[PDB]
C-alpha cells in the first residue's frame, strides 16, 4: 500500500 | 519458552516499579508494557532478498491528580529510565485541567483474574527455514503461467509477544501470544497492461497455516483473473462486496458506534440506539474469549473484562462501543472496547458465491477498494473499486478505474443477503454481501 | 557533527575507533556496503478540547540499526539502546546475509560539509510551557468567536527534536539535528440539528514562534483557526456531487498530493530497478503534457519535507524528474543507484533506526506556467473546482490513483457556483498527466501537513503545484 494523508 | 518467561518476569517488575513510584504523588495510575521478538524475510525469484531480525519494547504510563491527566513513554526499561518516565507524566499533570471523566477504570470492571485464551504457540524457525517457506510460495506462483513476467516476492513472518498491564486498584496481569504468516505477490502482463495480486495464510500456530504451494496457486489465480480490465460506463447497478471487502463494509460500523464519536455528536448513527439499522435477520456476534482467536483478548487496554455480546441483534443496534472516558461522558459504564473489537461473526443465509451471482443476474462484484472516502459524520461513501462485471449470472470481464458511491445508512439497511463463503483470516468474519443499487462512476 | 557525536557516541561510552571495529566485523563477509545508524528523539504533545487543556504527553526513543548489503540482498538488525554490545550483537546478526568471506577493504571514514537547512535549536526547550498553551487557548477563542454555529474545537500542538549519525563502509560519516513542529485545528458546526466538521493547520522545521508570526496581516494561529471554521461551514452547505467523467480544476498547494501519487511514487528507484513501475525504461519519453515540469527538492530551508542530509548521509538535492513532459530520471537510495548504474540523489530515507531505508520523496511539486487561475476557471463549461483535498492511495503497477476532495464546487459557464460534497476522484497516472492542458502562475506548497506511507513506513513530506486543469477525470459523486 502507498497511502498519503494530512 | 525460556526466553519468553525471562522477558515476562522483567516486564512484570517494570510495571510494579512504575506504579510504586507514582503512588505517593498521584490519585491513580495505569501502566502498560510490551516486548515483541521475531524474524521477517523476503525472497525475489526464489532467492533470499531481505533478512530482518525484530526486537521491540515499550513502557507507557498515565497518571491522574485532581482529575488532571499526564502521559509518558520510553523504550528503555532501566530503573533510572522508568523513574524519569514517571516524573515526566507527573510534571505534565500539574499543568493540564481537571476533567472528571478521566481516570483509572472502575474497580468492579477489572480483570483481576484474567482468563487464559491459549494465544501462544511458539516455533523455532531459523532464517534459512523461513527463506525456504517464502521461496516455495513465490516459486509456485511464478511457475503457474507464462504471462507472469515479474514479481514482488515471497514473504514469511514469525513473532512472539508479551504484554503486561497494571493499575492503582491493584490489578497486575500479563499474557503471551504468537503470530505467523506466509504470502506471495506476482505480476502478469497482457498487451502492455500490467496487473499485480497476492495470496496469504496467517495463524497463531505454524501447523494452522496453508502450504506454500497453496499460497502460490491462489496468488497466480487471483493475478491472472485481473488481466485486460474494462472501465465501465457511468450507471446505477446492483453491487456484491466479495467476502474480502465485505468484512470492511461492516468495519465502518465501529467508528459510527464508538463512544468517542457519540458523545461528540460526530456520528451519523447518533439517534439510532435501539433502532433497526440492518435487515431483521442479521445478527453481529462478538466473541472476545475464543481460544487461539486472531483478535481474542483477556482484557482491554484499560484492564477491563471483555464479554460475549450481540452488537447487532435481529437488525437492531443494541449498544455503543465504550471505553472508561466515553462511558463517563454518557452516564454509562465501559463495555471493554479500549483498543477496538474482539472477533465479530456474521452467519451466512444459505447461498454460495455462485448462487449469489445467479440471484443478482446483472451487476458489479467488487474485490478491492482504494482510498478513504467515508464520512464519519454523514455516512457518505465514495471509494475507488476493482472487480468483475456480471451478466446472465456469469463473470464477463474484470473492471477497474471506477468508483462506487452511496450512503452507509441506506447501504446497511437494504442489504439483500450475506453468503456462506466466510472470510476466516480477519477480525470481522463474514461472506459476500449483495446490495440492490449503487452509483458507479466511469466513462 | 561534533555536537551530535558528543551526545550519541561519547555519552554512551563510544569512540570513532569503535565504529572502525564494528564496520570491520561486517566486512569479514563479501559485501558491497554496510552501515551503522544512531538516533535519539524526544516528542511532546498538548491537546485542548472542551475549552480546557485536556492532555499532554512526553515520549523518548533511542537506538542503533545495522545493515549488511550484497547486490539485491540486505541483512538487518537493531536495538533500542546505544552501546558497544548492542552494535556487536546487531552487526553479527546482519552479516549472516552472506556466508562467503570478503577482502575486508573498507574506505577510511571522513566527513564533509553540507548546507544547513534548519535550526539546531531544540523547539521543546525554546518556548515556555504557558506560552505554548496560550497558542491553543487563542485558537479556541478565535474559532468560537468566528461564527455562533461553532460548537466544538480540538486544537493540538506537537514537537519533535531528533539527533542522527551515520557511518558506512564507503567512508561516509555524517550527522543531522532535526526539529519538527505542528499545529492542528478541528471544529464542529451545528445548525437546526445538522452537523459538519472542518480542519486546518501546518508547521515545519523550526520552533513554535512560527505560529504567532504574521500571515498576510494577521497572527498565523488566528488565520488557521478562522480557516477551519470556513471549511466546516462550506461542508455544512454542500450538496451532492455529480458522477462521471468531466473536466477538473485542481487548486494550488496541498492538491499537489495528486502529483505525488500520479507520478512521484512512480519515479522512486526501487520500483523502476525491479521493472514494476509503469515508468520503467521510459527515460527520454513523453510521460506528461509539454506544459509540465516536476521536481523533488530536498533543499528548501525550514520545510517539513526537507533533508539537510538523508538517512544515508547524502545531502538533499534539487532533482528535476520531468522537464517539459520528458522523463529525466528517478529518485534513489544507495542500493538501487548501484544496481541501476546511477548515482545517489538525496532520497534515501527511513522512519527510524528500527526500519530499512528506501527511495522516498522530500518536497515534490510542479513548476508554474503562464495561465492565470481566472483564465483556467473561465475555460470550463461544466466541471469541478477542487481547492482542497484529504488523502488517497496509488497502485504503481496498474497505474491507478484515488484521492478524496475536502472542498469542491461546480463550475458552470466558466464561473464557480455550488459547493459539492466530498467525492473520490480516480484515474490513470500517465493518462492524467497527458490531459493537463493549462498550468497556472500561482505555485504554492502545503502548509506543513504531509504524511507519506510506503511499506508501512510513515514520513514527513511536502507537495505543491499552481492551479491547473485536467481535461477529463472520473468524479465519484452520486448525482
Ligand atoms: Na496514591
Ligand atoms: Na547545497
Ligand atoms: Zn506517498
Numbering used by the authors:
A (entry chain E): 600 to 605
B (entry chain B): 8 to 450
C (entry chain A): 3 to 481
The authors write:
Using a combination of biochemical and crystallographic methods we show that E. coli TldD and TldE interact to form a heterodimeric metalloprotease. TldD/E cleaves the N-terminal leader sequence from the modified MccB17 precursor peptide, to yield mature antibiotic, while it has no effect on the unmodified peptide. Both proteins are essential for the activity; however, only the TldD subunit forms a novel metal-containing active site within the hollow core of the heterodimer. Peptide substrates are bound in a sequence-independent manner through β sheet interactions with TldD and are likely cleaved via a thermolysin-type mechanism.
